[PDB]
C-alpha cells in the first residue's frame, strides 16, 4: 500500500516533469523530506 | 382641447432634452479626457 502511494506520486512527479515547471529539486526535495518524516513516524509506531 | 394642448405643451417643454446633453458636454469639457501616458500606472 505504501508502494502503491509512492508509485502514485511517482507518476504524479512524472506528470510534473513532463509539464516543465521551475525549481523541481527544491520542491520534490521538500516533499521527499515530508514522506521521509511520515515514514519515520510510521516505522516508529510499527516497531512499537 | 384647449386644456389638452396646454397640458401637453407644458409636458412637451418639460420633455426637452437639450439641457441634459449640454450638461453632459459641459461635464466632458470639465473632464477634458486625455488617453496618453504610461500604460501601467501604480
Amino acid at each position: 500500500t505504501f508502494s502503491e502511494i509512492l508509485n502514485r506520486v511517482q507518476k504524479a512527479v512524472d506528470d510534473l516533469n513532463l509539464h516543465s515547471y521551475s525549481n523541481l529539486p527544491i520542491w520534490v526535495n521538500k516533499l521527499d523530506m515530508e514522506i521521509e518524516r511520515i515514514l519515520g513516524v510510521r516505522l516508529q509506531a510499527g516497531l512499537r | 382641447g384647449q386644456k389638452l394642448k396646454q397640458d401637453g405643451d407644458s409636458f412637451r417643454m418639460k420633455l426637452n432634452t437639450q439641457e441634459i446633453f449640454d450638461d453632459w458636454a459641459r461635464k466632458v469639457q470639465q473632464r477634458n479626457l486625455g488617453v496618453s501616458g504610461r500604460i501601467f500606472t501604480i
Binding site: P25, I26 | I42
Partner: peptide
C-alpha cells in the same frame, strides 16, 4: 563531484516587484 544543487529561482512577490516598478517609474 556530486550534483551540486542549483540556486532556487524564486518568484518575486507582488509587493517587492511593485516597489521595484515604483522605483522604476519614480526614476522615470
Amino acid at each position: 563531484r556530486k550534483l551540486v544543487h542549483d540556486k532556487e529561482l524564486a518568484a518575486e512577490d507582488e509587493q517587492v516587484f511593485l516597489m521595484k516598478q515604483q522605483s522604476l517609474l519614480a526614476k522615470q
